[PDB]
């Protein structure tokens, strides 16, 4: 009987003495102070972490965490690659305009549409542009711009668009939140709210994944390209019947696309290794390096290197990755002349006052994990209007009625 | 205890194969499969032979009830990773080192590496062979309509570039896509005669090479009971095997069905009880 | 089922000894004897040679019950031709016709004869060479004090 | 599933149909009109028989039988054979005075003593004196008569004697009843108030045969010989040591003894074999016969095969087993000169009026089934005065005070 606080629950099938046992730390402990461990770090009694809306606490060598529900993401990246709200992944290369998440599943408030076109050579799709219908609002994702279109003429579902480092970032007060770097990658955000009432390409969001591939008319297949080719929006898209394989189709190219890729399996992601798993995000960029092969193909590099630094900043592991060489980014473009204010934040975590947050406004979700260029506004001004990128005084900054920044 | 070559035994003590309790049997149709039921809901499959596997089957009624590396079974496979003292780890070998058995284990890490890169001479051979998986020339191009080997063919290439032995984890590798072939209705007859056929031709002078061979396809010992050990809810495996009829004698060769045997001792097919020794069945 | 050849087969199959199991435990320490023990509190031994013989063994927890031809172990052993429906017998095979375990088996009758007088040729080998449980130059002396 | 209603305790464990069983007599029968056995005889449903005090009743193939509680018998038999009263069967050949009953068991109120002397040269004894001890009253049975000895002053025990067939009869108010056979056999009674309160070579009568070897210091020994040399009465006589085997030290007596003996396994008594075991009754009767060589050896024997037929009229099998050649019996010896009225009655089962009984007068057990001469009075005189042996008429017969017959 040699006890270990790490085999509590084990069984003891197959020194310390009797009554104490041993932490994994170092001497024999009682069975009340032993520590917790979580993700190759060991905490002590008492101890206090979050994970993504809540609160834990090594209480007797367990975790005695809160009881909330958080918010629900689907993500959409890079050459055809899909995470739904129950995190299931999966890959659908289609050409047409597909339903990325909706309400009006078998009457409904609102429907995100995603517009995959092709981009390469060897039949792999990327998203490109995104509609989003919230009641008889349109908004449009096109162009590293939004667009208004149909503007109804009194309901107006409030809304609210800002840009959060290098991504533009919309809002709904319903609940609705679409995250988009304005290339490719998408992350939409649900409420709590939407429990179990919403389909799509994302899944329908019910905490149990062996569903998610129902498809239009209400039936759970096994088929990547069954489910995805039941969502696409015009009846006259072709189908797609098989997912193309583009470092085969492109031999010349892999040689290249596996040695810059393979930044994330080394020594400058190593703090991220034991929170977030690098091998889903190694096979994607090696997928999207091997298939831009019409050009600018150090684009689709660096966004997928950007999609695992992400997980490492929401997960606690901030890593700066990005070199003069390797994915150089130019923030001092927006200082005024040369007084120095705006600097690159790797891992976004600055919490400044704006000219919205001045006057209570404030958001329902964490956006502070978003890579970007950041100001640091100086001490005769320190109130940072966003519709202009302008450090203001607290009083000469604008409006904001009906979404539109009025001097 | 199953070991690996062979060898069940019960509480440190060898035991003979057929062993048909109250709450478990344990049955041997293969030489090289064994078949463990039990009353509970569980059922093993424990593979000898190129390597050594395992696989485990449990009823729907059991879901959300079970603790260990294969998970908890509820639906969501987002929680599968989540340890017996609270949350859900990041890596596969974070969460199972709580579930070591024995206190005095270390502690194993991650291998972010691939063995294709590392040996140069066996890259080759895993290219050449695991393709046959995914080319339609083959009797593997039956199943790319159910099971999809574009997963099989990653896993493939990894055990053969690992191991020392590389044909024994290609073989292995390439009898796990015909297992879970035939889980799905497609049986796949003969596929090995180009590729693992280092063992077809090995089997005695009567009873030849199946794919298809099951529990209750066994002697007239068998028939005897006919009722108390068959054990329905498996799946069928490769071995050597008799045809659509002469089942098995007591020893040896595989008679036709007149002269099996009349199993008490086995008697041949000559005693007179009043019980006249016949076909099968006997004429009491 | 314990054959008169050795031959334990446990559900119509041959095992191997020793056979050690959670509720009981079958032995075989001299090819000549089988030793079974349960948990339960039954004890068994098998002779195998030269005539097959058994011994069967209660705790005093069971004492009152058990039924069989071994009696019902309460102390009186003149209830114990007593049958399972009522009323005490008068001769063994008269109360052991009650224990059959098949209803096809016809029922058996007492033998008020001698054997050793239907025999003469067998009856002074049986004199000569049993009368050593009485005399006191053998070792069998040594248990007559007991 | 082949039910037979004498296996339905057993198990069924290795025709009629469903339903139905079989019952032994015939065809198949329900499970509710199911017979019963017993001694190899078939009664059918609500069928009666009696078991010694009690009432049995064939109800669903069981017996259901009432529960009273009987008297007790202690035997003592031809050359040293005991049975005590919870039925343990036993040799002891001692020459002393030994206790047989007593109550004065570690005060007490009764005591019955047997005096067993040599008979034979073998060194066997046998029982040739009974003492009776009730209260101060002394009783002595010796010679083929009881004589009163030491009648106390005013208490006096209500006891009667009379003579029943061949056998004289003591009995008690107290519940203390003596039988005796005039030669060597004795039958004590106890009622059943006596229960776990007695002592000495016939036990202690508390329906439990594994404690009746208690010594007189109280101790259960294993040892026939141990149990019986501590009952003796006087310290000075001497100790048993073996016991004697008369047909190895008689071998010319062995060869008479067998072949006259042989008629308790033989077709005379077959009516009996199935309801009591002749076997301890034979080797009794060749024991007493090889031993019985100084002289009368035809008593010996003819005492041992009536100890056996009585056990058969008591059980409900009389048995005519006397011949002019076999133990011949002289009953015509009582009749008035030639007017024929006592008969042998080979079983006892009559009942006709004495002149105590016409006087309300009974007594507590049933002693009809003793072997002897029976009167069969006329109808102009019938009642029989027992202490004359002869047939009077109801008015002067006699006055019964004090147990002394007044004409
Ligand atoms: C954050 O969520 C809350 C909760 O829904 C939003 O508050 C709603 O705002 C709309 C109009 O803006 C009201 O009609 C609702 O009644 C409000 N809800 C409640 C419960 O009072 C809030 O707008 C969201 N935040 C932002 C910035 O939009
Ligand atoms: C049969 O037993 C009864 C019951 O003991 C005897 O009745 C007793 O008689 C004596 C005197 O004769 C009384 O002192 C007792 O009180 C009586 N007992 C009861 C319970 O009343 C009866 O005497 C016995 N029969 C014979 C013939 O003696
Ligand atoms: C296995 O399949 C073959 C077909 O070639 C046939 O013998 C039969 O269907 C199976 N054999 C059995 C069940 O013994
Ligand atoms: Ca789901
Ligand atoms: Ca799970
Ligand atoms: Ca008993
Ligand atoms: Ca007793």
Avoid at chain 1, 29 to 43: F, S
Avoid at chain 1, 339 to 352: A, K, L, Q, T
Avoid at chain 1, 381 to 401: F, H, N, Q, S
Avoid at chain 2, 118 to 138: M, V
């Amino acid at each position: 009987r040699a006890l270990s606080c790490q085999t509590l629950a084990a069984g003891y099938y197959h020194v310390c003495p009797d009554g104490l046992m041993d932490d994994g730390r170092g001497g024999c402990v009682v069975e009340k102070e032993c520590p917790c461990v979580h993700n190759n770090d060991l905490y002590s009694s008492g101890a206090k972490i979050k994970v993504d809306c809540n609160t834990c606490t090594c209480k007797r060598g367990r975790w005695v965490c809160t009881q909330a529900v958080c918010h629900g993401t689907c993500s959409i990246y890079g050459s055809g690659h899909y995470i739904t709200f129950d995190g299931k992944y999966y890959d659908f290369d289609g050409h047409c305009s597909y339903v990325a998440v909706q309400d009006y599943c078998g009457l409904g408030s609102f429907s995100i549409i995603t517009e995959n076109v092709p981009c390469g050579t060897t039949g792999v799709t990327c998203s490109k542009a995104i509609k989003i219908f919230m009641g008889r609002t349109e908004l449009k994702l096109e162009d590293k711009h939004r667009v208004v279109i149909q503007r109804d003429e009194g309901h107006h579902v409030a809304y609210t668009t800002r840009e959060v480092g290098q991504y533009l970032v919309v809002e709904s007060s319903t609940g609705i939140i679409v995250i988009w770097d304005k290339r490719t990658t998408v992350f939409i955000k649900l409420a709590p709210s939407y429990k179990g009432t919403v389909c799509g390409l994302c899944g329908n969001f019910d905490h149990r994944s062996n569903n998610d591939f129902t498809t239009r008319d209400h039936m759970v297949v096994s088929s990547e390209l069954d489910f995805g080719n039941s969502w696409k929006e015009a009846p006259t898209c072709p189908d797609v019947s098989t997912n193309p394989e583009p470092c085969s189709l492109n031999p010349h190219r892999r040689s290249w696309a596996e040695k810059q890729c393979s930044i994330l399996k080394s020594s400058v992601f190593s703090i991220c290794h034991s929170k977030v798993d690098p091998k889903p995000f190694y096979e994607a960029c090696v997928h999207d390096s091997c298939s831009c092969d019409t050009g600018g193909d150090c684009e689709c590099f660096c966004s997928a290197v950007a999609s695992y630094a992400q997980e490492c900043t929401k997960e606690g592991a901030c890593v700066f990755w990005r070199t003069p060489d390797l994915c150089p980014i130019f923030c001092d473009y927006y200082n005024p002349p040369h007084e120095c204010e705006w600097h690159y934040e790797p891992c976004g975590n600055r919490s400044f006052e704006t000219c919205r947050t001045i006057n209570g406004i404030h958001s329902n979700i964490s956006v502070s994990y978003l890579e970007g260029c950041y100001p640091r506004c100086p001490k005769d001004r320190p109130i940072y209007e966003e519709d202009l990128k302008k450090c203001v005084t607290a009083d000469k900054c604008g409006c904001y009625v009906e979404d539109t920044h009025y001097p | 205890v199953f070991k690996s070559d062979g060898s069940v035994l019960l509480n440190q003590l060898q035991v003979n194969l057929p062993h048909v309790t109250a709450s478990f049997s344990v049955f041997r149709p293969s030489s090289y499969h064994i078949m463990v039921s039990m009353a509970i809901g569980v059922r093993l499959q424990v593979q000898l032979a190129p390597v050594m596997q395992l696989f485990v089957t449990l009823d729907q009624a059991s879901q959300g009830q079970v603790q260990g590396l294969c998970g908890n079974f509820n639906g969501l496979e987002g929680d599968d990773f989540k340890t017996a003292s609270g949350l859900v780890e990041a890596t596969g070998a974070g969460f199972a080192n709580t579930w070591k058995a024995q206190s005095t284990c270390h502690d194993k890490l991650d291998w972010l590496d691939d063995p294709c890169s590392l040996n140069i001479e066996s890259a080759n051979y895993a290219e050449h062979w695991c393709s046959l998986l995914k080319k339609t020339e083959t009797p593997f191009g039956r199943c790319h309509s159910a099971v999809d080997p574009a997963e099989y063919y990653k896993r493939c290439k990894y055990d053969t570039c690992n191991c020392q032995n590389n044909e024994d984890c290609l073989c292995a590798a390439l009898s796990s896509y015909a297992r879970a072939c035939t889980a799905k209705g497609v049986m796949l007859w003969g596929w090995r005669e180009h590729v693992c056929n280092k063992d077809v031709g090995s089997c005695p002078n009567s009873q030849v090479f199946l794919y298809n061979l099951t529990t209750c396809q066994q002697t007239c010992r068998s028939l005897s009971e006919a009722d108390s050990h068959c054990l329905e809810g498996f799946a069928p495996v490769d071995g050597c095997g008799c045809p659509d009829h002469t089942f098995l004698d007591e020893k040896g060769r595989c008679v036709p069905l007149a002269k099996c045997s009349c199993y008490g001792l086995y008697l041949e097919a000559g005693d007179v009880v009043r019980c006249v020794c016949r076909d099968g069945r006997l004429h009491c």
